[PDB]
Design a protein around this motif. Sequence first.
Motif, PDB file in Angstrom:
ATOM      1  N   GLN A 273      -9.299 -26.241 -62.268  1.00  0.00           N
ATOM      2  CA  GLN A 273      -8.828 -27.602 -62.011  1.00  0.00           C
ATOM      3  C   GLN A 273      -7.900 -28.152 -63.096  1.00  0.00           C
ATOM      4  O   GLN A 273      -6.870 -28.758 -62.791  1.00  0.00           O
ATOM      5  N   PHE A 274      -8.266 -27.947 -64.358  1.00  0.00           N
ATOM      6  CA  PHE A 274      -7.485 -28.410 -65.489  1.00  0.00           C
ATOM      7  C   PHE A 274      -6.116 -27.758 -65.419  1.00  0.00           C
ATOM      8  O   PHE A 274      -5.096 -28.443 -65.497  1.00  0.00           O
ATOM      9  N   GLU A 275      -6.115 -26.434 -65.235  1.00  0.00           N
ATOM     10  CA  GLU A 275      -4.867 -25.688 -65.083  1.00  0.00           C
ATOM     11  C   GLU A 275      -3.984 -26.299 -63.991  1.00  0.00           C
ATOM     12  O   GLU A 275      -2.801 -26.558 -64.219  1.00  0.00           O
ATOM     13  N   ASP A 276      -4.556 -26.519 -62.806  1.00  0.00           N
ATOM     14  CA  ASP A 276      -3.801 -27.058 -61.674  1.00  0.00           C
ATOM     15  C   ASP A 276      -3.176 -28.401 -62.033  1.00  0.00           C
ATOM     16  O   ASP A 276      -2.054 -28.675 -61.690  1.00  0.00           O
TER      17      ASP A 276
ATOM     18  N   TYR B 143       1.612 -31.653 -63.625  1.00  0.00           N
ATOM     19  CA  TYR B 143       2.251 -32.492 -64.673  1.00  0.00           C
ATOM     20  C   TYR B 143       3.635 -31.932 -65.050  1.00  0.00           C
ATOM     21  O   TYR B 143       4.449 -32.646 -65.640  1.00  0.00           O
ATOM     22  N   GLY B 144       3.905 -30.669 -64.711  1.00  0.00           N
ATOM     23  CA  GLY B 144       5.126 -29.980 -65.141  1.00  0.00           C
ATOM     24  C   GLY B 144       5.017 -29.328 -66.518  1.00  0.00           C
ATOM     25  O   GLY B 144       6.018 -28.938 -67.124  1.00  0.00           O
ATOM     26  N   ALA B 145       3.797 -29.142 -66.998  1.00  0.00           N
ATOM     27  CA  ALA B 145       3.607 -28.498 -68.282  1.00  0.00           C
ATOM     28  C   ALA B 145       3.440 -26.999 -68.106  1.00  0.00           C
ATOM     29  O   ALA B 145       3.129 -26.519 -67.005  1.00  0.00           O
ATOM     30  N   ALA B 146       3.647 -26.263 -69.192  1.00  0.00           N
ATOM     31  CA  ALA B 146       3.280 -24.859 -69.230  1.00  0.00           C
ATOM     32  C   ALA B 146       1.810 -24.748 -69.589  1.00  0.00           C
ATOM     33  O   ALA B 146       1.252 -25.624 -70.242  1.00  0.00           O
ATOM     34  N   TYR B 147       1.169 -23.691 -69.096  1.00  0.00           N
ATOM     35  CA  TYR B 147      -0.252 -23.485 -69.297  1.00  0.00           C
ATOM     36  C   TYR B 147      -0.557 -22.002 -69.480  1.00  0.00           C
ATOM     37  O   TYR B 147      -0.089 -21.169 -68.710  1.00  0.00           O
ATOM     38  N   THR B 148      -1.399 -21.697 -70.456  1.00  0.00           N
ATOM     39  CA  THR B 148      -1.891 -20.340 -70.639  1.00  0.00           C
ATOM     40  C   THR B 148      -3.290 -20.409 -71.191  1.00  0.00           C
ATOM     41  O   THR B 148      -3.621 -21.317 -71.931  1.00  0.00           O
TER      42      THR B 148
ATOM     43  N   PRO C 206      -7.113 -44.204 -83.481  1.00  0.00           N
ATOM     44  CA  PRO C 206      -6.311 -44.375 -82.282  1.00  0.00           C
ATOM     45  C   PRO C 206      -6.478 -43.219 -81.330  1.00  0.00           C
ATOM     46  O   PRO C 206      -6.704 -42.079 -81.762  1.00  0.00           O
ATOM     47  N   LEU C 207      -6.343 -43.505 -80.044  1.00  0.00           N
ATOM     48  CA  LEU C 207      -6.362 -42.442 -79.038  1.00  0.00           C
ATOM     49  C   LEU C 207      -5.080 -42.453 -78.270  1.00  0.00           C
ATOM     50  O   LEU C 207      -4.550 -43.518 -77.948  1.00  0.00           O
ATOM     51  N   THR C 208      -4.606 -41.261 -77.953  1.00  0.00           N
ATOM     52  CA  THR C 208      -3.439 -41.095 -77.121  1.00  0.00           C
ATOM     53  C   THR C 208      -3.886 -40.218 -75.959  1.00  0.00           C
ATOM     54  O   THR C 208      -4.340 -39.107 -76.164  1.00  0.00           O
ATOM     55  N   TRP C 209      -3.793 -40.741 -74.744  1.00  0.00           N
ATOM     56  CA  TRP C 209      -4.192 -39.992 -73.563  1.00  0.00           C
ATOM     57  C   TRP C 209      -2.937 -39.563 -72.837  1.00  0.00           C
ATOM     58  O   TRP C 209      -2.174 -40.406 -72.363  1.00  0.00           O
ATOM     59  N   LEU C 210      -2.758 -38.256 -72.722  1.00  0.00           N
ATOM     60  CA  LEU C 210      -1.604 -37.656 -72.079  1.00  0.00           C
ATOM     61  C   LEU C 210      -2.131 -37.060 -70.788  1.00  0.00           C
ATOM     62  O   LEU C 210      -3.040 -36.261 -70.840  1.00  0.00           O
ATOM     63  N   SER C 211      -1.587 -37.461 -69.640  1.00  0.00           N
ATOM     64  CA  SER C 211      -2.201 -37.119 -68.349  1.00  0.00           C
ATOM     65  C   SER C 211      -1.198 -36.679 -67.312  1.00  0.00           C
ATOM     66  O   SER C 211      -0.128 -37.280 -67.175  1.00  0.00           O
ATOM     67  N   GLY C 212      -1.559 -35.622 -66.594  1.00  0.00           N
ATOM     68  CA  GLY C 212      -0.844 -35.200 -65.398  1.00  0.00           C
ATOM     69  C   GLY C 212      -1.180 -36.109 -64.239  1.00  0.00           C
ATOM     70  O   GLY C 212      -0.327 -36.382 -63.393  1.00  0.00           O
ATOM     71  N   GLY C 213      -2.428 -36.579 -64.219  1.00  0.00           N
ATOM     72  CA  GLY C 213      -2.924 -37.455 -63.164  1.00  0.00           C
ATOM     73  C   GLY C 213      -3.697 -36.659 -62.133  1.00  0.00           C
ATOM     74  O   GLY C 213      -3.775 -35.437 -62.215  1.00  0.00           O
ATOM     75  N   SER C 214      -4.278 -37.354 -61.168  1.00  0.00           N
ATOM     76  CA  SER C 214      -5.040 -36.696 -60.122  1.00  0.00           C
ATOM     77  C   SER C 214      -4.078 -36.054 -59.119  1.00  0.00           C
ATOM     78  O   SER C 214      -4.451 -35.107 -58.411  1.00  0.00           O
TER      79      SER C 214
ATOM     80  N   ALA D 201      -8.602 -46.399 -65.192  1.00  0.00           N
ATOM     81  CA  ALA D 201      -8.774 -45.166 -64.433  1.00  0.00           C
ATOM     82  C   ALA D 201      -7.592 -44.899 -63.501  1.00  0.00           C
ATOM     83  O   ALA D 201      -7.113 -43.770 -63.393  1.00  0.00           O
ATOM     84  N   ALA D 202      -7.120 -45.930 -62.809  1.00  0.00           N
ATOM     85  CA  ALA D 202      -6.022 -45.738 -61.862  1.00  0.00           C
ATOM     86  C   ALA D 202      -4.727 -45.321 -62.544  1.00  0.00           C
ATOM     87  O   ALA D 202      -3.982 -44.508 -62.018  1.00  0.00           O
ATOM     88  N   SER D 203      -4.458 -45.901 -63.707  1.00  0.00           N
ATOM     89  CA  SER D 203      -3.305 -45.517 -64.529  1.00  0.00           C
ATOM     90  C   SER D 203      -3.400 -44.051 -64.917  1.00  0.00           C
ATOM     91  O   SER D 203      -2.412 -43.327 -64.864  1.00  0.00           O
ATOM     92  N   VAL D 204      -4.607 -43.613 -65.268  1.00  0.00           N
ATOM     93  CA  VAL D 204      -4.832 -42.233 -65.670  1.00  0.00           C
ATOM     94  C   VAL D 204      -4.574 -41.327 -64.482  1.00  0.00           C
ATOM     95  O   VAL D 204      -3.879 -40.323 -64.606  1.00  0.00           O
ATOM     96  N   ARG D 205      -5.112 -41.711 -63.325  1.00  0.00           N
ATOM     97  CA  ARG D 205      -4.889 -40.954 -62.106  1.00  0.00           C
ATOM     98  C   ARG D 205      -3.398 -40.882 -61.726  1.00  0.00           C
ATOM     99  O   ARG D 205      -2.955 -39.894 -61.140  1.00  0.00           O
ATOM    100  N   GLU D 206      -2.644 -41.920 -62.087  1.00  0.00           N
ATOM    101  CA  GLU D 206      -1.189 -41.994 -61.901  1.00  0.00           C
ATOM    102  C   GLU D 206      -0.375 -41.191 -62.909  1.00  0.00           C
ATOM    103  O   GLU D 206       0.850 -41.037 -62.759  1.00  0.00           O
ATOM    104  N   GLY D 207      -1.045 -40.678 -63.937  1.00  0.00           N
ATOM    105  CA  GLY D 207      -0.381 -39.926 -64.975  1.00  0.00           C
ATOM    106  C   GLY D 207       0.249 -40.786 -66.050  1.00  0.00           C
ATOM    107  O   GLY D 207       1.050 -40.284 -66.861  1.00  0.00           O
ATOM    108  N   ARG D 208      -0.106 -42.071 -66.103  1.00  0.00           N
ATOM    109  CA  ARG D 208       0.461 -42.936 -67.125  1.00  0.00           C
ATOM    110  C   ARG D 208      -0.224 -42.617 -68.434  1.00  0.00           C
ATOM    111  O   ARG D 208      -1.431 -42.394 -68.467  1.00  0.00           O
ATOM    112  N   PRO D 209       0.543 -42.610 -69.519  1.00  0.00           N
ATOM    113  CA  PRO D 209      -0.064 -42.427 -70.826  1.00  0.00           C
ATOM    114  C   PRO D 209      -0.862 -43.636 -71.243  1.00  0.00           C
ATOM    115  O   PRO D 209      -0.521 -44.770 -70.876  1.00  0.00           O
TER     116      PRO D 209
END
Lengths: 164, 164
Positions: free
Chosen positions: A10-13, A18-23, A142-150, B134-142
């Motif tokens: 799931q994480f990989e997908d 997100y358009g990232a590379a994954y290995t 501080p936290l930085t959340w970088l997300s592909g999203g659902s 949560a919705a922002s995260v699901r949207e892929g927003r940082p």
Amino acid sequence: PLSRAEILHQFEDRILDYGAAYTHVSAAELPGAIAKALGNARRVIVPAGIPAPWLTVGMDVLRDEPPLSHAELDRADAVLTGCAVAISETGTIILDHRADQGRRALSLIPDFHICVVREDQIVQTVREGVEAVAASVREGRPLTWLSGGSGVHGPRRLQVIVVG
Amino acid sequence: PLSRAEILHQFEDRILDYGAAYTHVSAAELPGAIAKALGNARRVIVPAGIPAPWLTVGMDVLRDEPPLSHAELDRADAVLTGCAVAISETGTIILDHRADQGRRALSLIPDFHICVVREDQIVQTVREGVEAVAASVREGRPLTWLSGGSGVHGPRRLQVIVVG
């Protein structure tokens, strides 16, 4: 709960979407994977807490002590970091900017982020992800959340390397 | 659950312990509060989604279209933003970089952040805070979580303005 295998898949997908590379590599393969990800653009910013064994001769290692200027960060080819936790459901990587991640500028200004995620840092749900970083939050980190999203917005290139 | 009054007081305490400035004003008082926070250093970066009514003549408004260079951001006196949600227990402000907050660079590079938090955006617990974004995260927003807890590293000065 999903199995660990399903979580990894799931994480990989989500990272790929997100358009990232994954290995996903072994610990032994890690230094090579990082080297392979850099290619011929080897000017890589390395936070102080990155384990020496991840690094390889031929890397043009930039250190952030003293702090790299915006221009130095912009001219770097890549930044190499760990993370605090990753969340499979949303393809999120959370940084808490500990020693293996460095200050916020290091993962914002350079255009290519290579982020090493230990298999054991990947959790399924956002709830678990937050639980994992709760102590950092309580510490005022501080936290930085970088997300592909659902780049202007951040690194235009991301390589995720799962290890172990 | 804590009462709204206790939540507000808790948020204030945690923001003050962070070393930030804090004020709670009415909507009518908001533009003045922002103006007062800027003082005589009025070169303020204003994300596109900041409501016009928050802004006042005498502000030297910088807009991020086209994107401000690192040097322009570094020379700005302040950045003015909203937020996604704030958490009282940890004195956390979460940005999701929507139009009233702007890209990550805008709240990283300038040295003074004025962050407007609507009373209704303040929740008690981290759990609720995450639910809110949560919705922002699901949207892929940082997400950027700035926390007091229970410049080189970012803005050395933070003014929190709670409104309403």
